[PDB]
Scaffold this active site. Sequence first.
Site, PDB file in Angstrom:
ATOM      1  N   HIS B 202       0.771  -1.234   0.000  1.00  0.00           N
ATOM      2  CA  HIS B 202       0.000   0.000   0.000  1.00  0.00           C
ATOM      3  C   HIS B 202       0.800   1.281   0.000  1.00  0.00           C
ATOM      4  CE1 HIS B 202      -3.693  -2.407   1.592  1.00  0.00           C
ATOM      5  NE2 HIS B 202      -3.374  -2.698   0.344  1.00  0.00           N
ATOM      6  N   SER B 206      -0.986  -0.794  -6.322  1.00  0.00           N
ATOM      7  CA  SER B 206      -0.659  -1.730  -7.378  1.00  0.00           C
ATOM      8  C   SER B 206       0.021  -1.194  -8.629  1.00  0.00           C
ATOM      9  CB  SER B 206      -1.921  -2.455  -7.790  1.00  0.00           C
ATOM     10  OG  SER B 206      -2.550  -2.977  -6.641  1.00  0.00           O
ATOM     11  N   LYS B 228     -14.913  -8.079  -9.254  1.00  0.00           N
ATOM     12  CA  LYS B 228     -14.010  -8.790 -10.145  1.00  0.00           C
ATOM     13  C   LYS B 228     -13.331  -9.963  -9.439  1.00  0.00           C
ATOM     14  CE  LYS B 228     -10.487  -8.226 -13.613  1.00  0.00           C
ATOM     15  NZ  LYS B 228      -9.540  -7.324 -14.307  1.00  0.00           N
ATOM     16  N   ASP B 229     -12.990  -9.766  -8.164  1.00  0.00           N
ATOM     17  CA  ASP B 229     -12.329 -10.798  -7.367  1.00  0.00           C
ATOM     18  C   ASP B 229     -13.255 -11.953  -6.979  1.00  0.00           C
ATOM     19  OD1 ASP B 229      -9.711  -8.942  -5.486  1.00  0.00           O
ATOM     20  OD2 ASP B 229      -9.902  -9.479  -7.620  1.00  0.00           O
ATOM     21  N   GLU B 272       5.530 -34.222  -4.348  1.00  0.00           N
ATOM     22  CA  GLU B 272       4.280 -33.650  -4.814  1.00  0.00           C
ATOM     23  C   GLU B 272       4.579 -32.761  -6.012  1.00  0.00           C
ATOM     24  OE1 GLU B 272       0.941 -34.086  -3.472  1.00  0.00           O
ATOM     25  OE2 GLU B 272       2.075 -35.872  -2.898  1.00  0.00           O
TER      26      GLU B 272
HETATM   27  C1  HEM Z   1       0.652 -16.507   0.978  1.00  0.00           C
HETATM   28  C2  HEM Z   1       1.274 -15.776  -0.206  1.00  0.00           C
HETATM   29  C3  HEM Z   1       0.866 -14.555  -0.727  1.00  0.00           C
HETATM   30  C4  HEM Z   1      -0.288 -13.837  -0.543  1.00  0.00           C
HETATM   31  C5  HEM Z   1      -1.448 -14.162   0.341  1.00  0.00           C
HETATM   32  C6  HEM Z   1      -0.166 -12.641  -1.360  1.00  0.00           C
HETATM   33  C7  HEM Z   1      -1.124 -11.673  -1.410  1.00  0.00           C
HETATM   34  C8  HEM Z   1      -1.009 -10.533  -2.215  1.00  0.00           C
HETATM   35  C9  HEM Z   1      -2.059  -9.558  -2.376  1.00  0.00           C
HETATM   36  C10 HEM Z   1      -3.403  -9.621  -1.686  1.00  0.00           C
HETATM   37  C11 HEM Z   1      -1.627  -8.700  -3.349  1.00  0.00           C
HETATM   38  C12 HEM Z   1      -2.443  -7.622  -4.064  1.00  0.00           C
HETATM   39  C13 HEM Z   1      -3.245  -8.127  -5.270  1.00  0.00           C
HETATM   40  C14 HEM Z   1      -2.379  -8.644  -6.426  1.00  0.00           C
HETATM   41  O1  HEM Z   1      -1.692  -7.819  -7.074  1.00  0.00           O
HETATM   42  O2  HEM Z   1      -2.391  -9.873  -6.690  1.00  0.00           O
HETATM   43  C15 HEM Z   1      -0.262  -9.072  -3.651  1.00  0.00           C
HETATM   44  C16 HEM Z   1       0.559  -8.367  -4.458  1.00  0.00           C
HETATM   45  C17 HEM Z   1       1.893  -8.634  -4.686  1.00  0.00           C
HETATM   46  N1  HEM Z   1       2.521  -9.743  -4.138  1.00  0.00           N
HETATM   47 FE1  HEM Z   1       1.776 -11.198  -3.098  1.00  0.00          FE
HETATM   48  N2  HEM Z   1       1.066 -12.588  -2.056  1.00  0.00           N
HETATM   49  C18 HEM Z   1       1.671 -13.785  -1.727  1.00  0.00           C
HETATM   50  C19 HEM Z   1       2.907 -14.223  -2.205  1.00  0.00           C
HETATM   51  C20 HEM Z   1       3.739 -13.508  -3.002  1.00  0.00           C
HETATM   52  C21 HEM Z   1       4.947 -14.000  -3.605  1.00  0.00           C
HETATM   53  C22 HEM Z   1       5.456 -15.417  -3.464  1.00  0.00           C
HETATM   54  C23 HEM Z   1       5.487 -12.951  -4.310  1.00  0.00           C
HETATM   55  C24 HEM Z   1       6.702 -12.829  -5.007  1.00  0.00           C
HETATM   56  C25 HEM Z   1       7.889 -13.685  -4.763  1.00  0.00           C
HETATM   57  C26 HEM Z   1       4.527 -11.879  -4.178  1.00  0.00           C
HETATM   58  C27 HEM Z   1       4.688 -10.672  -4.718  1.00  0.00           C
HETATM   59  C28 HEM Z   1       3.782  -9.653  -4.688  1.00  0.00           C
HETATM   60  C29 HEM Z   1       4.014  -8.372  -5.379  1.00  0.00           C
HETATM   61  C30 HEM Z   1       5.351  -7.888  -5.932  1.00  0.00           C
HETATM   62  C31 HEM Z   1       2.826  -7.751  -5.504  1.00  0.00           C
HETATM   63  C32 HEM Z   1       2.631  -6.488  -6.361  1.00  0.00           C
HETATM   64  C33 HEM Z   1       1.558  -6.642  -7.421  1.00  0.00           C
HETATM   65  C34 HEM Z   1       1.542  -5.512  -8.445  1.00  0.00           C
HETATM   66  O3  HEM Z   1       2.321  -5.583  -9.424  1.00  0.00           O
HETATM   67  O4  HEM Z   1       0.753  -4.548  -8.272  1.00  0.00           O
HETATM   68  N3  HEM Z   1       3.432 -12.229  -3.428  1.00  0.00           N
HETATM   69  N4  HEM Z   1       0.122 -10.213  -3.003  1.00  0.00           N
HETATM   70  C1  LIG Z   2       7.165 -34.900   4.083  1.00  0.00           C
HETATM   71  S1  LIG Z   2       7.389 -35.449   2.412  1.00  0.00           S
HETATM   72  C2  LIG Z   2       6.970 -34.195   1.295  1.00  0.00           C
HETATM   73  N1  LIG Z   2       6.579 -32.964   1.641  1.00  0.00           N
HETATM   74  C3  LIG Z   2       6.309 -32.227   0.396  1.00  0.00           C
HETATM   75  C4  LIG Z   2       4.814 -31.869   0.338  1.00  0.00           C
HETATM   76  C5  LIG Z   2       7.206 -30.989   0.294  1.00  0.00           C
HETATM   77  C6  LIG Z   2       8.577 -31.143   0.162  1.00  0.00           C
HETATM   78  C7  LIG Z   2       9.412 -30.039   0.061  1.00  0.00           C
HETATM   79  C8  LIG Z   2       8.873 -28.759   0.089  1.00  0.00           C
HETATM   80  C9  LIG Z   2       7.499 -28.587   0.221  1.00  0.00           C
HETATM   81  C10 LIG Z   2       6.661 -29.713   0.325  1.00  0.00           C
HETATM   82  C11 LIG Z   2       6.638 -33.272  -0.688  1.00  0.00           C
HETATM   83  O1  LIG Z   2       6.579 -33.152  -1.890  1.00  0.00           O
HETATM   84  N2  LIG Z   2       7.008 -34.382  -0.023  1.00  0.00           N
HETATM   85  N3  LIG Z   2       7.388 -35.595  -0.628  1.00  0.00           N
HETATM   86  C12 LIG Z   2       8.696 -35.863  -1.059  1.00  0.00           C
HETATM   87  C13 LIG Z   2       8.960 -37.090  -1.711  1.00  0.00           C
HETATM   88  C14 LIG Z   2      10.257 -37.380  -2.167  1.00  0.00           C
HETATM   89  C15 LIG Z   2      11.300 -36.458  -1.977  1.00  0.00           C
HETATM   90  C16 LIG Z   2      11.047 -35.235  -1.325  1.00  0.00           C
HETATM   91  C17 LIG Z   2       9.751 -34.933  -0.866  1.00  0.00           C
END
Ligand code: HEM
Ligand SMILES: CSC1=N[C@@](C)(c2ccccc2)C(=O)N1Nc1ccccc1
Lengths: 55, 380, 54, 49, 49, 61, 101, 81, 241
Positions: B202, B206, B228-229, B272
């Site tokens: 914020h 965005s 939209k969401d 997985e």
């Molecule tokens: C539990 C995981 C996450 C949740 C709940 C989450 C939630 C959100 C929310 C609610 C927004 C605003 C809406 C949107 O633009 O989609 C957002 C934006 C953003 N999130 Fe996440 N996010 C997560 C993981 C991540 C990850 C893994 C990355 C990057 C490695 C990331 C990067 C960003 C960025 C950079 C924005 C900016 C969007 C824009 O360009 O305006 N988020 N995220």
């Molecule tokens: C507790 S075993 C396990 N946990 C998961 C869900 C996981 C691993 C690593 C990161 C996030 C989730 C997955 O794929 N495996 N299986 C598995 C089977 C063979 C070799 C490695 C992992």
Amino acid sequence: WAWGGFSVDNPTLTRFFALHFLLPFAIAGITIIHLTFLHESGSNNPLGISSDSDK
Amino acid sequence: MAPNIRKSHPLLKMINNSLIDLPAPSNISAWWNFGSLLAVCLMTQILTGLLLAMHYTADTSLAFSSVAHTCRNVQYGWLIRNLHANGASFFFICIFLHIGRGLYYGSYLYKETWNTGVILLLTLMATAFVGYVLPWGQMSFWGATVITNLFSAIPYIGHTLVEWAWGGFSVDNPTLTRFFALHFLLPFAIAGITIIHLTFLHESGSNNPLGISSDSDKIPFHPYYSFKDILGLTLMLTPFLTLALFSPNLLGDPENFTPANPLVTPPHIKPEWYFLFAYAILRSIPNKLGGVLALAASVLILFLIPFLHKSKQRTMTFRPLSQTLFWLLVANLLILTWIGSQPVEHPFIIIGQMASLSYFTILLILFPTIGTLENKMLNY
Amino acid sequence: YTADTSLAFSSVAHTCRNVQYGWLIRNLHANGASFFFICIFLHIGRGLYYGSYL
Amino acid sequence: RHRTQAEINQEAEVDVSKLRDPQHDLDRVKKPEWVILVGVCTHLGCVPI
Amino acid sequence: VHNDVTVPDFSAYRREDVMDATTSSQTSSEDRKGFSYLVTATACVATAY
Amino acid sequence: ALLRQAYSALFRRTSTFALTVVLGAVLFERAFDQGADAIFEHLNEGKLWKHIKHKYEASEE
Amino acid sequence: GRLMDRIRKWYYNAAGFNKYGLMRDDTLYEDDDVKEALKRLPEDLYNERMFRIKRALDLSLKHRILPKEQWVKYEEDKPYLEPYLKEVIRERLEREAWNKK
Amino acid sequence: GIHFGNLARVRHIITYSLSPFEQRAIPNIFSDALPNVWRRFSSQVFKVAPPFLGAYLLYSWGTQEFERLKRKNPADYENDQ
Amino acid sequence: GELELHPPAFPWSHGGPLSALDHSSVRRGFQVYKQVCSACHSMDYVAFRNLIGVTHTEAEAKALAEEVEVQDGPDENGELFMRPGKISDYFPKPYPNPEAARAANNGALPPDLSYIVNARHGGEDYVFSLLTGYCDPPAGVVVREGLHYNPYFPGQAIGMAPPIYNEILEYDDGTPATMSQIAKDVCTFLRWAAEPEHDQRKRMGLKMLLISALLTSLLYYMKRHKWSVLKSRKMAYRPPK
Ligand code: HEM
Ligand SMILES: CSC1=N[C@@](C)(c2ccccc2)C(=O)N1Nc1ccccc1
Ligand code: HEC
Ligand code: HEM
Ligand code: HEM
Ligand SMILES: CCCCCCCCO[C@@H]1O[C@H](CO)[C@@H](O)[C@H](O)[C@H]1O
């Protein structure tokens, strides 16, 4: 319903563990709300008179 | 003070400044939907997770059966278990697309939002890992064995840390009970860090598909994006529920319907689907420690993305060369996913190393290089 | 800990008897709860006395 | 494991010291026919068939 | 000057009943709204279900 | 003039709109369940215990 | 010969920001230098830039582009900000160089 | 949190809009919508499709090659007796 | 060495997304289990009560359970005793522990069948193919004593002798007890044992699909409705003189 049966038993125990694990966090969350409302006015003091002249 | 409560009240003020009067770009596409979907998976996983936790028992002699008791005796226990198991997958599908969007549109230029985002991915992964151990089937046990043993590669402290984590000399009951606690806890750390994520976001609001300022054209989050969401939610909810109700086990290893046996290792130990690509990378380097580093880097590389931006433009919308490069990367991830599900044998081994190698090459060299090359073609 | 009526009691015993400093951690948790209530009652009293409830 | 004849000579035959961890087949043994091991792969802890 | 400003033509978007400039739009208003609100009420029903 | 009548009587006042959604859900549920349950049983004639039951439901010895 | 020119003209058209009616300079990421340069633009150039952008965002949300006849032509693209931007960066480097003892 | 009112400096722009109730929700499907979906599709197929096609081939090959190496090589038993 | 034969896909009457299980086939399957497989295979997660309203009436189920002796106690002397079964009892284990089991099967361990169709790639398709697929080994292959040749089993040498043959039992419902008929039925029963919620799951999927179609459309309209304002919006740049 709460018991998960006809008396306190294992389903009561497992659900109580989950609840016990969870609630402390609701407490932590609500504490933030508590302090958030508080900062709207700041603390009260032992004399009950405004402390704006001495903070 | 203020004529309307929505703005004066200390709590509503907050809901209003982040979900009602929040200024949003008028042109953000469906790629901006995954953030809220992610938030909904989180709340959904937590809800179903507690419901399952209330009938689960963390003991190696009761885990597998308490899950069976849940699916066979608890009213709708089977349903709640499917929704939780498959919800984990919807979560990863959403996180991958969320990241993809970010990379494509240069959202990473919002550094704090990006970095907390990477922390969120790491935390979600740990969660899934410790969560997947709980049913204690063959795959749960052996995968947990392969993964925890990765840490023993760290020189000097390795063996020590591993046995520490295990609470013994191998994955066993003390590993199970502590994993349950962790699995119960982490989702909340994810929720908390999400608030930090959104808080940094914020500060700037965005980004949008054109990568140019939208201050000249913003709109209230409500009702434009709330509607939209909700739409996006129901569109992605159909596949989820179809999978969950019509193909409950499409994505799972049948090996996990067999109680963990410490003495018999499954012929084909594969992770997985959402961890396959990383596994493929781990195996590319035949050296124990080298593979761990490769794996580490495969995810930590994300922290580097903001520093490899050379384009004078934020998104890849007007950058045809980068776009090709982007899809190569995506396809490269597809190949790794595929390679990660196969046995270590020719031709896979070589195809695997190629993909691993080109993965790091595209991100570390081609992207910044092409970015510079593109600036010159624009005469900058 | 293990939440099963057949293992609860003994897992707590296992904690206090086998887990390194298990007994300590259990005392601190069990008495910590009392400390918590002592403090909440005084906190409330303070509030009532000084009209913080306003 | 109880080794036979092709499990004792076939061993002392392939290069004395030419492996990850250089050792002689008669190194880790109190009897040629008896080999006791911890069936855990020194990689990521799996079991060898 | 502002006098030289006129609202563009929205015929490519107007609902059938308000297409004609010489017809009160109030007569089709309750239908135009009733319809839209009908969709919404129905979504609430399905959702409640 | 259903849309018109519907609008004035049900959709205009926010209060009536809510009652309409409640009774609507009630009527919808009853009809939807029965209908869906029919479609299902019809696509599976002769396979459910509902169908087999009569054979053992107190028929021998 | 005209190789570089040929290439640049190809890229320009391949990039496609001209389909929204945007000038190359309208697409620059507003980092610190760009922000400062924008502040130096003359009123009219600034208001024109704003309209073009607001208009493109509108096109973006509608999922449309301009009719082929309104697309900016490679040779009519006006580099309105480049001159300013260069001065800005030139000044910044001066300060930077000078502050290094 | 609060941003509307202090966002940008804008001059001389007029906009026109109609109530949602005065217009169609999904207008000109055939004269506008679809024609554009085609435009969009077209303009991205050769950017996207190519690499996925490439991956698909590599998949096919490697899969077939893997199975091929499971088959018997008749030339290993020609002179077996 | 890495060769394996994969089972074909049989058209089970419960394969379709809205296809319930054929309960007559499941009832017959239960008989096959009770009279043939249960001698070596346990089914730890199914209780006689589970049969009620699915394949048997409550009376039939009670009878089935009483046919078994179950251990209970301790009694007043701290003694364990036997008693007739109850519908709340689970199916009897053929052996006290896997050691005993192997001991009675040449060291081979017959797996519990509660989730067998979910613990094997191919599910019923594989179980059916295995049951009806024994045959003599091909030239150059020798099965060790105690094992049997079966191309569908990995490695092809299984420790289970063919369990079923024509008329190895008589279905009290009159169905011609042919080997394939038997396999087909027991496999259907196995599918049920593994996922008792099978049918209900599919009835829900049906409603999920309908509600979803409806709801998705209604919300699509509402989204378009609200957004129409911006979608058709027009603008112009009218700079001064
Ligand atoms: C539990 C995981 C996450 C949740 C709940 C989450 C939630 C959100 C929310 C609610 C927004 C605003 C809406 C949107 O633009 O989609 C957002 C934006 C953003 N999130 Fe996440 N996010 C997560 C993981 C991540 C990850 C893994 C990355 C990057 C490695 C990331 C990067 C960003 C960025 C950079 C924005 C900016 C969007 C824009 O360009 O305006 N988020 N995220
Ligand atoms: C507790 S075993 C396990 N946990 C998961 C869900 C996981 C691993 C690593 C990161 C996030 C989730 C997955 O794929 N495996 N299986 C598995 C089977 C063979 C070799 C490695 C992992
Ligand atoms: C005399 C004991 C016996 C009978 C009777 C028997 N089985 Fe088995 N079954 C076994 C044994 C032993 C194994 C172990 C095979 C192995 O692992 O080599 C086994 C294994 C199996 C397996 C698959 C094992 C795998 O790894 O794929 C299934 C499925 C199975 N039996 C089904 C049946 C069914 C259904 C029936 C009744 C129609 C049946 N069995 C009757 C002894 C028996
Ligand atoms: C987990 C429980 C609680 C926590 C962590 C908590 C925490 C706090 C904190 C940090 C303060 C500020 C410092 C202070 O004045 O002591 C505070 C103030 C206050 N709390 Fe609580 N509190 C809790 C429970 C309660 C209860 C039970 C009540 C009353 C029923 C209450 C009423 C107040 C009020 C009225 C103040 C104002 C203090 C003043 O007069 O300035 N608190 N609390
Ligand atoms: C980010 C959220 C979460 C993710 C990604 C997630 C993921 C998982 C995964 C992968 C499984 C294994 C499913 C299987 O059996 O195949 C699992 C199991 C489980 N999860 Fe979660 N989970 C989340 C949150 C929670 C929460 C908050 C709780 C409880 C408070 C919880 C409780 C459980 C329980 C009890 C199981 C074991 C029973 C079972 O496997 O069905 N989970 N979770
Ligand atoms: C797979 C064996 C299914 C046997 C039961 C047939 C009835 C399926 O039908 C469903 O059963 C559920 C639980 O019984 C009920 O809660 C549902 O309302 C009902 O529609």
